[PDB]
Design a protein around this ligand. Structure first.
Ligand SMILES: *[C@@H]1O[C@H](CO)[C@@H](O[C@@H]2O[C@H](CO)[C@@H](O)[C@H](O)[C@H]2NC(C)=O)[C@H](O)[C@H]1NC(C)=O
Ligand SMILES: *[C@@H]1O[C@H](CO)[C@@H](O[C@@H]2O[C@H](CO)[C@@H](O)[C@H](O)[C@H]2NC(C)=O)[C@H](O)[C@H]1NC(C)=O
Lengths: 87, 55, 81, 260
C-alpha cells in the first residue's frame, strides 16, 4: 500500500528515492537508561532524528508525544484499536 | 421494566414519559449542583409534585 | 499473530486496520467490539522542510479524486472469502 | 450549525444569559447580545482555559460558509482571509481548495459525505447517480448549494451537476420535510450532521449502508490566518484532548440517538 502511494506521490514532485528497512524492527518510544535522564529515542523515529533518514512512510500513530519533536502531515486513513480472540 | 440513569429517554426527555420528584427536597439540591446533569433540572423544575406520599 | 493463533496467548490488542484485514485474510479469526481510541496514519519528517507542506496538500488532492479509496478497495476488496 | 454551535435568545430579563453558555454578538458589518453554547463552544472554552487566552464570539452575515464565486471569498473563510477575523471555529471541513491560502489544525471530528434516504444506491459509481437518464427518474438529491459539497461533486461525476439544478434549496430541515412528504428520496450531505439528525427522530429514517461508504474521508478542523505561531500551540493541545477521552464525553453530552 504505502509504496504504491509513494510511487503515485513521486510521479508528481520530481523525486528520486532510496528505500531501506529499519535496523531492529521496533516502532519507537522514548527510552532513558540509568545515568542518562533524557529519554533518548530508539527505533525508526530515532533513526530519522539521527540523520540517516529523510522521511518515514509507514502506518505510524499520531500520539501527542511524537508531534512534540516531528511535524506530521494530514492523515490519510482514520482508524482505531481492537481485540483479536480465536473464534 | 426500566433502567438506571442511562437511557436516552432521560438524557433527552420525551413527551410520553414524565420524570418527577418531590419538590423542596435534598434531591433538588443534588440535581441543582451537577454541571452536566443541569438540563434534567430544567425538566424537573417544569413539573414536580410539591407534595408527599399523596404524589 | 502466530503465537495467539497457536493458542499460546488468548487475545491480541492491535490497530483496527491490520487485524481487520488479517482476520478476513487468513481464517477463522474475528474481532469483537469497536474502537476505544481513534486516530490515523500520516507522513513524518524533520521540522521546517517544504516537502512536508507540499505532500500534505497532495494527500488531500489524492483523497478528493478517490485515488486512495480506489487503491484501498483494490487491495482489501479481494478478501472475506 | 445545528448540533455543534447553538445560538439562543438571552436570559428572560437579566441580559447575562443562563450559565454553561458564552455571550455572542451578531454584527451588521442593532448589536443584540445572544448566548451561544454547544460542542465547539465547550471545546474553545477548554482550549482557552488551557492555553490562557481571551476571546469574543462574532457571527457572519454574508452567506453561511462561502465560496470563491467570481474570484472573491465570502463567508468565514473570506473573513479569515481578509484579516478581519483571526480565527474560525465550528462546522468547517478541510480540502485542497481552502488549504492553499489558510492554515489548519489537526482534525478532531471524522466527517464524510453520505446519502440520506427513506426507510437502492451503493456508491457514486452506481448507475443511478452516474448517468441519471433511465426510465424511472430518481429525483432531487438535496446537496445544499454553495457549501462544502458542490466543489467535491465538481470533479467526481461531472454530468451529475447540470442534472442537479432543481432540489430542496431551503435548509437541511427542508430536506427532512420533503423526505417525510415524499417529493424526493435522495439526499447527499455531510456525515456527522446527518448521523446526528437521523439519531433522534420519531420512528427513524434509515441512512444508507453507513460510514463504510463515505466519500472523501476528511476531518473537521480550525481555520486561522497563516504564519501565526499560536497554531502550533493549540495543535499540541488538540492531541492531548484526544488522550483523556475528552472527545468521548463532549460528544456523549452532545450526541445521542433514539434509533441510531
Ligand atoms: C511545492 O509546490 C509548489 C506548487 O507547485 C511549488 O512551490 C512554489 O510555488 C510557487 C507558486 O506556484 C512557484 O512560483 C514557485 O516556483 C514554486 N517553487 C519551486 C521551487 O518550484 C513547488 O512545485 C513545490 N516546491 C517548493 C519548494 O515550493
Ligand atoms: C450561492 O450563490 C448564489 C448566487 O449568488 C446565491 O443565490 C443568490 O441569493 C440571493 C439572495 O438574496 C439572490 O438575491 C440572488 O438572486 C441569488 N442568485 C442566484 C443566481 O440564484 C446563493 O444564495 C448562494 N448560496 C448560499 C448558501 O448562500
Amino acid at each position: 500500500f504505502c509504496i504504491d502511494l509513494l510511487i503515485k506521490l513521486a510521479r508528481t514532485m520530481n523525486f528520486t528515492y532510496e528505500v531501506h528497512l529499519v535496523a531492529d524492527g521496533k516502532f519507537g518510544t522514548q527510552e532513558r537508561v540509568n545515568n542518562s535522564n533524557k529519554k533518548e529515542w530508539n527505533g525508526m523515529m530515532g533513526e530519522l532524528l539521527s540523520g540517516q533518514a529523510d522521511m518515514i512512510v509507514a502506518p505510524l500513530t499520531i500520539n501527542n508525544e511524537r508531534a512534540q519533536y516531528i511535524e506530521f502531515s494530514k492523515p490519510f486513513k482514520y482508524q482505531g484499536l481492537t481485540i483479536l480472540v480465536k473464534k | 421494566r426500566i433502567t438506571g440513569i442511562n437511557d436516552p429517554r432521560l438524557r433527552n426527555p420525551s413527551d410520553k414519559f414524565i420524570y418527577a420528584t418531590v419538590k423542596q427536597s435534598s434531591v433538588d439540591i443534588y440535581f441543582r449542583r451537577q454541571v452536566e446533569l443541569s438540563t434534567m433540572y430544567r425538566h424537573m423544575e417544569k413539573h414536580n409534585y410539591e407534595s408527599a406520599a399523596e404524589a | 499473530i502466530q503465537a495467539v493463533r497457536d493458542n499460546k496467548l488468548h487475545a491480541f490488542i492491535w490497530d483496527s486496520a491490520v487485524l481487520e484485514f488479517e482476520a478476513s485474510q487468513k481464517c477463522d479469526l474475528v474481532t469483537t467490539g469497536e474502537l476505544f481510541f481513534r486516530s490515523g496514519f500520516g507522513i513524518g519528517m524533520r521540522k521546517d522542510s517544504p516537502w512536508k507542506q507540499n505532500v500534505s496538500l497532495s494527500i488531500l488532492k489524492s483523497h478528493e479524486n478517490g485515488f486512495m479509496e480506489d487503491l484501498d478497495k483494490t487491495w482489501v476488496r479481494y478478501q472475506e472469502c | 450549525e445545528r448540533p455543534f454551535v447553538i445560538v439562543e435568545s438571552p436570559d428572560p430579563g437579566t441580559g447575562g444569559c443562563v450559565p454553561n453558555t458564552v455571550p455572542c454578538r451578531r454584527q451588521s458589518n442593532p448589536y443584540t447580545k445572544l448566548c451561544c453554547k454547544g460542542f465547539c463552544i465547550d471545546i474553545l472554552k477548554k482550549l482557552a482555559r488551557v492555553v490562557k487566552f481571551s476571546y469574543d464570539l462574532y457571527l457572519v452575515t454574508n452567506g453561511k460558509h462561502g465560496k470563491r464565486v467570481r474570484g472573491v471569498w465570502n463567508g468565514m473563510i473570506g473573513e479569515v482571509y481578509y484579516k478581519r477575523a483571526d480565527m474560525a471555529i465550528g462546522s468547517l471541513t478541510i480540502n485542497e481548495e481552502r488549504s492553499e491560502i489558510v492554515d489548519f489544525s489537526v482534525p478532531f471530528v471524522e466527517t464524510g459525505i453520505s446519502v440520506m434516504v427513506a426507510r437502492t444506491v451503493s456508491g457514486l459509481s452506481d448507475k443511478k447517480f452516474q448517468r441519471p437518464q433511465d426510465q424511472y427518474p430518481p429525483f432531487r438529491f438535496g446537496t445544499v448549494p454553495n457549501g462544502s459539497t458542490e466543489r467535491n461533486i465538481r470533479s467526481n461525476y461531472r454530468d451529475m451537476h447540470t442534472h442537479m439544478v432543481k432540489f430542496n434549496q431551503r435548509s437541511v430541515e427542508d430536506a427532512l420535510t420533503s423526505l417525510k412528504m415524499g417529493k424526493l428520496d435522495a439526499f447527499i450531505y455531510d456525515a456527522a450532521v446527518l448521523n446526528y439528525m437521523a439519531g433522534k427522530d420519531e420512528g427513524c429514517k434509515l441512512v444508507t449502508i453507513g460510514s463504510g461508504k463515505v466519500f472523501a474521508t476528511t476531518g473537521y478542523g480550525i481555520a486561522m490566518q497563516k504564519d501565526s505561531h499560536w497554531k502550533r500551540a493549540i495543535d499540541l493541545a488538540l492531541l492531548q484532548f484526544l488522550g483523556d477521552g475528552e472527545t468521548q464525553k463532549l460528544e456523549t453530552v452532545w450526541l445521542s440517538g433514539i434509533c441510531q
